[PDB]
C-alpha cells in the first residue's frame, strides 16, 4: 500500500521545529491499521473521518511527523496558540485531516536527557500554516547586533527537550503524525480499496 508504515513505524523522528513531511500519492492505501489500533493516545480528525475513509479518494495526502511533549499535543489543532503552535508547527483554520499522537517514553526518552529533540523558543512573528523554520540564527532581543554569538539580548532560538524516563506523563515525549487530505479538482492519485 502507501508508505504509511515508513512514517508511523519510523525508527527515529525529527524535532518539531524541523518536522518532516512525506508526500504520499500515486498509491492505494489501507486505513484500517490506524483506527482499529489502540496504541494511539489521541486520534483527532477535522473535516474527514478515518472510518468511512477506506472507500474514498484524495488528490494529495501529506504525512507530517515530529515529537513534542504531552502538554503540547493539544496545540496541534486549528485555531490553537502556544509556543509549539506559534513557533514550531501551525495548522490552518480550515484544516482537513487528522492528528495522531502516542506516548514514546520507551523510544525517545534517555537517561540524562536526549539532547537531540529541539523546539523553537524565540521568534519575532508567528508561523504561517504549514511553515517550517529551521534557522539557527542567534535571536536578537535588543538593538545591538548579536554577530552570531550568544549573550545579553542574544539567545539561541532553539531549546532542547530534557526528555528523561523519570518525568511525568506530560513531560514525556509524544510522537505526532499529522495527515493532511486534499481533494482538489484534479485526478485523484490517493485512493483506498
Amino acid at each position, epitope marked *: 500500500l502507501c508508505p504509511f508504515g515508513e512514517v508511523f513505524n519510523a525508527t527515529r523522528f525529527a524535532s518539531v521545529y524541523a518536522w518532516n513531511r512525506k508526500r504520499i500519492s500515486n498509491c492505494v492505501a489501507d486505513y484500517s491499521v490506524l483506527y482499529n489500533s489502540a496504541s494511539f493516545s489521541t486520534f483527532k480528525c477535522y473535516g474527514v*473521518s*478515518p472510518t468511512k475513509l477506506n472507500d474514498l479518494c484524495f488528490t494529495n495526502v501529506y504525512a507530517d511527523s515530529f515529537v513534542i511533549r504531552g502538554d503540547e499535543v493539544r496545540q496541534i489543532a486549528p485555531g490553537q496558540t502556544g509556543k509549539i503552535a506559534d513557533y514550531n508547527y501551525k495548522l490552518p483554520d*480550515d484544516f482537513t485531516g487528522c492528528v495522531i499522537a502516542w506516548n514514546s517514553n520507551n523510544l525517545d526518552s534517555k537517561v540524562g536527557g536526549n539532547y537531540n529533540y529541539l523546539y523553537r523558543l524565540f521568534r519575532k512573528s508567528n508561523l504561517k500554516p504549514f511553515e517550517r523554520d529551521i534557522s539557527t540564527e542567534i535571536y536578537q532581543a535588543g538593538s545591538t547586533p548579536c554577530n552570531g554569538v550568544e549573550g545579553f539580548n542574544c539567545y539561541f532560538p532553539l531549546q532542547s527537550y530534557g526528555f528523561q524516563p523519570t518525568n511525568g506523563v506530560g513531560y514525556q515525549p509524544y510522537r505526532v503524525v499529522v495527515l493532511s487530505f486534499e481533494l482538489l479538482h484534479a485526478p485523484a492519485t490517493v485512493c483506498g480499496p
Partner: antibody, heavy 119, light 113 residues
Framework: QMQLVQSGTEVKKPGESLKISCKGSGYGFITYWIGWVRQMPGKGLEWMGIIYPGDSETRYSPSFQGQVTISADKSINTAYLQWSSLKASDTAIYYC????????????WGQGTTVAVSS | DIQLTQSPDSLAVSLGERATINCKSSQSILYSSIIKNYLAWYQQKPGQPPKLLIYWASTRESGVPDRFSGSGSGTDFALTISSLQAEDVAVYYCQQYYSTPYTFGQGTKVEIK
C-alpha cells in the same frame, strides 16, 4: 461499526439537578466525537454540544452553553449531559450522536433518554 | 449561527412516485481542500432515533436504498426519493457540519397520498 447506549427515563421537578449518560461500545472509540441533541415534545431536533472523550474538548451551541454542561470519561467510554436547576421547558427527549471527527456526519445514534420536568 | 431552512414543511406522495425536499443555507457549505459541501440528510421514523442517510449532500451511507439521492451545491440542496414506499414515511432533516455549532432544518414530514 460502533453503537451507543443511553441512560433510562427520568421524571424530575423544577429546581432539581439531573445527569444523563451515553456510553459507547464498538471498535475505534478513539476517533469518535460525541454530541447531544434535544427534541422538544412534538418538535424538531436541536443541536446542543459536542465533546471529544480523549481530551474533553467541549463545544457548545450559543443557545445552550449557559445552562448545560457536557463531560466525558474515556475510561468508561461514556459522555454525560448534566443540569443544575431543571426547568419545565427542559422536558424533552435527548439523543446522543457519534461522529468520527469534527465537521463530520453523525453516523452512530443512541436510543434516546426521556426527561419530564413539571410542577 | 449558520441557518438552514427547508421546504415544504409537509408533503404527500403516492407510492411509486418522486418526493422532493429542499434545503436552503444562509452561507456556502463548501470546503477549500476537499471541494465537497458539508451537508447531511437524516431520517427519523416515529419512536426511533434519527438515522443518517446521505452525507456530503451527494454520497449515500451504506445500507441506504438506491432510490434515495442527494443533489445541490452552494446554498441550495435537495433530497429526492424515487419510487416512494411506506418505509420512507418519516420526518427528514438536513444538517450542516461545515463548522460548529451544528444546525438542523425545521424538518419535513412525508405523508401518504
Amino acid at each position: 461499526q460502533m453503537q451507543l447506549v443511553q441512560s433510562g427515563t427520568e421524571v424530575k421537578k423544577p429546581g432539581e439537578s439531573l445527569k444523563i449518560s451515553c456510553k459507547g461500545s464498538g471498535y475505534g472509540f478513539i476517533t469518535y466525537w460525541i454530541g447531544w441533541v434535544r427534541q422538544m415534545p412534538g418538535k424538531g431536533l436541536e443541536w446542543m454540544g459536542i465533546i471529544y472523550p480523549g481530551d474533553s474538548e467541549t463545544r457548545y451551541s450559543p443557545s445552550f452553553q449557559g445552562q448545560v454542561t457536557i463531560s466525558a470519561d474515556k475510561s468508561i467510554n461514556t459522555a454525560y449531559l448534566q443540569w443544575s436547576s431543571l426547568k419545565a421547558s427542559d422536558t424533552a427527549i435527548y439523543y446522543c450522536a457519534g461522529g468520527s471527527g469534527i465537521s463530520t456526519p453523525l453516523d452512530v445514534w443512541g436510543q434516546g433518554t426521556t426527561v419530564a420536568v413539571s410542577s | 449561527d449558520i441557518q438552514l431552512t427547508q421546504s415544504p414543511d409537509s408533503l404527500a406522495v403516492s407510492l411509486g412516485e418522486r418526493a422532493t425536499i429542499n434545503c436552503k443555507s444562509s452561507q456556502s457549505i463548501l470546503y477549500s481542500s476537499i471541494i465537497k459541501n458539508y451537508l447531511a440528510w437524516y431520517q427519523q421514523k416515529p419512536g426511533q432515533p434519527p438515522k443518517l442517510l446521505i452525507y456530503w449532500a451527494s454520497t449515500r451511507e451504506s445500507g441506504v436504498p438506491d432510490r434515495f439521492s442527494g443533489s445541490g451545491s452552494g446554498t441550495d440542496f435537495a433530497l429526492t426519493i424515487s419510487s416512494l414506499q411506506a418505509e420512507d414515511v418519516a420526518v427528514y432533516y438536513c444538517q450542516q457540519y461545515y463548522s460548529t455549532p451544528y444546525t438542523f432544518g425545521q424538518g419535513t414530514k412525508v405523508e401518504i397520498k
